Amino acid sequence: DGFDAAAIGTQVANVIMGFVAMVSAVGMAAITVILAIQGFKMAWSMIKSVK
Amino acid sequence: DGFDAAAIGTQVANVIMGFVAMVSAVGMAAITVILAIQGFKMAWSMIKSVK
Amino acid sequence: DGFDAAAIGTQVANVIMGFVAMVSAVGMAAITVILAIQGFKMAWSMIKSVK
Amino acid sequence: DGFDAAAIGTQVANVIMGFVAMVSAVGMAAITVILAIQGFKMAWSMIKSVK
Amino acid sequence: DGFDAAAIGTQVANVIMGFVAMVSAVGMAAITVILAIQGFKMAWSMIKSVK
Amino acid sequence: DGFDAAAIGTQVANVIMGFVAMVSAVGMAAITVILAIQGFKMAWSMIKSVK
Amino acid sequence: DGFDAAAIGTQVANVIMGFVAMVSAVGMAAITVILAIQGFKMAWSMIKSVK
Amino acid sequence: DGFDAAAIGTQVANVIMGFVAMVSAVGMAAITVILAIQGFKMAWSMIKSVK
Amino acid sequence: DGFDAAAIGTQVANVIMGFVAMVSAVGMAAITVILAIQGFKMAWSMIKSVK
Amino acid sequence: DGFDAAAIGTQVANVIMGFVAMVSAVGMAAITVILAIQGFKMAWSMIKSVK
Amino acid sequence: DGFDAAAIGTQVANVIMGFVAMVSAVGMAAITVILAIQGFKMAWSMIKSVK
Amino acid sequence: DGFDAAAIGTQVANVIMGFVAMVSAVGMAAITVILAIQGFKMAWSMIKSVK
Amino acid sequence: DGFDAAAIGTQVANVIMGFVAMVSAVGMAAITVILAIQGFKMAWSMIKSVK
Amino acid sequence: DGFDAAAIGTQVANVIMGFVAMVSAVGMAAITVILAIQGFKMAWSMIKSVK
Amino acid sequence: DGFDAAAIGTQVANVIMGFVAMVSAVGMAAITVILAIQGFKMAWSMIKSVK
């Protein structure tokens, strides 16, 4: 009857495409860790196979 | 007696096949997130197994 | 006395076996949605476990 | 006799299609919460499977 | 008739957008735990694959 | 009306930030095990590749 | 005529906003339990995936 | 009028904070099992990767 | 009122600490298998690296 | 006038605190079943993840 | 008054402790299947890692 | 009263021990695949380490 | 006075213990379906984890 | 009195054992999909571990 | 009575065997990625073992 479906259907989507920011931010604060270990793993990794 | 069953039975269905749009839209605003993490996951994933 | 029980008892049933049509129609206008999400869910689902 | 059925039948419906607004508003004040947790859930979720 | 629908419809929403605070707070008091284990999991995790 | 939301919202969080202790304790009583095996794994691990 | 509606309408509400206390109290005596199990669940949960 | 709300509201809570005991007891009689398997799982687990 | 909580709370636990037996038994009938393969795996494993 | 309220009010309660017995008994004859399946579930559960 | 509570309370329990039999039987006719797959899974599983 | 529990309890089990056949059949039509790859994997596997 | 209570009280019960038959029959015509899907679910289920 | 219980009790079951057909059909139109992905998953899966 | 079960049972299946297309398409847009990394992985992989 009214059909206020798509009008609010975009409104809702716009609240939550403007939410990637958080996932990227917590992203960055994953990698710093994953590098820290990874880069530290690769430190000894060569000098395992130094032999 | 009257049998206004199918006539309105389509009417009702037409209000709600015209509702996928919202589910697609909130769809798109799922994937952007899921890529963001996923693509960021695959970033470190190769360079876990860099070794 | 009169026993107009089964005669109208079928009459009533015939108004309402001719009512499945609506339930099928609103059926179809469920699945289009459920696919939309489901198929979109399966989109990212493989590429979660891409790794 | 009078048949003031549809005339007021619309009148009543118009009081209550003009009621979605509230359901949308309490809608918005659901999602902010559901994001808050959800986005915070996804925060640790990647870094469960950091490994 | 009166149509005090949206006026109180916002009033109700404002009681409950001012409720995220609790969900964030119990949020923080989830992560401290989830880090505690997670960070402690990652402690041994590298030195599983020390080999 | 009353709005005793944040006041108890902190109260609840304080019961459960004071819960990490247990997770750390069961933490310690994970690692002792994980070392035991890990350190015992590394015992033979060098003297696999003694050759 | 008299219109002693709102005057007692508040009176009634005040008997029953002063009732949250009980729901909070039985609240606390839910969580102690839910922690007990939850914290005990998380005890073995890490050391399932110790592997 | 009487307002015997909090007085019995504590009374009820005290019947059911004195109920954790059972949940801890059935707790202990979970872990013995979960260890039994877990410790037995870790038995073969090292000597899978003995190689 | 009655407070038959801990009395039956132990009763229930005693039915189910007397249940480890089964988990140990199905334990033994895991390892026989896991040895069978494992010991058979280690059979060829040395004589892969015989070279 | 008479006020035979609490006198019979206890009388009634005493008929029905002496009713837990049945609920415990049908309790026991739940768990035997729930163990039977549960313990049988845990039988194959380890040897799913035997791998 | 009569207090035919425990007398029938056992009667009811005895109908339904004599019901485990079915759950064990449908038990056996689970495992035969679960072995069939499991044992067949373990067939190829070694000879994945044959290498 | 009637106690038609075990009589049908076997009847049900017999419908579903006569169901392994399907699981074996879909079994066979797993392995043909798993061999195909596995045997093809082992083809190049030796002639990786031909050197 | 007459006390034709238990005499008809059994009569009524005998009409409706002779009613399980239907519930078993509609039982069988549940499982055939539930197997059909279940057995078909287990078809792909192994060959999800074929990997 | 009449006892038209089993006579219609079969009638009802026969409407709904003649319903598996649909569940098999929607079955087939599950697997085609599940293969499509699965077979496509196994495509890259070998050539992950090509190395 | 009507038995419009298989007639619509095919109708439903035909909406969803005509759905593989999407899963193949999102398929292709998995592999391009998986190659990209895989082929790039194999780039350095030989020249790890160049030695």
Residue numbers in the entry:
A (entry chain 9), B (entry chain 9), C (entry chain 9), D (entry chain 9), E (entry chain 9), F (entry chain 9), ...: 1 to 51
From the paper:
We estimated the helical parameters from two-dimensional class averages and employed real-space helical refinement to solve the structure of the MDAΦ MCP to 3.7 Å resolution. The resulting cryo-EM map reveals α-helical MCPs packed into a tubular arrangement, with an overall diameter of ~62 Å and a central pore with a ~20 Å diameter. MCPs are arranged with a pentameric (C5) rotational symmetry around the filament axis, with a rise of 14.1 Å and 42.3° rotation per subunit, establishing MDAΦ as a class I inovirus. Each MCP of MDAΦ adopts a bent architecture with significantly higher curvature than what has been seen in previous inovirus capsid structures, showing an angle of ~45° between the N- and the C-terminal segments of the MCP. The first six residues of the MCP are poorly resolved with smeared density in the cryo-EM map, suggesting flexibility of this region. Consistent with past structural data on inoviruses, the MCP of MDAΦ contains numerous hydrophobic residues in the central segment, which form an extensive hydrophobic network through tight packing with other MCP subunits around the filament axis. The helical parameters of the MDAΦ capsid (rise: 14.1 Å, right-handed rotation 42.3°) are markedly different from other C5-symmetric class I phages such as the Ff group of phages (fd phage rise 16.6 Å, fd phage rotation 36.4° to 37.5°) and IKe (rise 16.8 Å, rotation 38.5°), with a lower rise resulting in a comparably higher number of MCP proteins in any given capsid segment. The C-terminus of the MDAΦ MCP, which is exposed to the phage lumen, contains three lysine residues with side chains extending toward the phage genome. To ascertain how bundling is mediated at the molecular level, we inspected our atomic model of the MDAΦ MCP and noticed that the N-terminal residues 1–6 form a surface-exposed segment with a prominent hydrophobic phenylalanine residue (F3) in the poorly resolved, flexible N-terminus of the protein, which is followed by further hydrophobic residues 5–9 (sequence AAAI).
Filamentous inoviruses such as MDAΦ are a genus of bacteriophages consisting of a single-stranded DNA (ssDNA) genome that is surrounded by an α-helical capsid, resulting in rod-like phage particles up to several micrometers in length but less than ten nanometers in diameter. In N. meningitidis, MDAΦ particles, after being secreted into the extracellular milieu, assemble into filament bundles that promote cohesion between cells, thus promoting the formation of biofilms. Here, we present the electron cryomicroscopy (cryo-EM) structure of native MDA inoviral bacteriophages isolated from N. meningitidis, revealing significant differences to previously solved inovirus capsid structures. Our structural data on the biomedically relevant MDA phage show that MDAΦ is a class I, C5-symmetric bacteriophage with dense MCP packing.
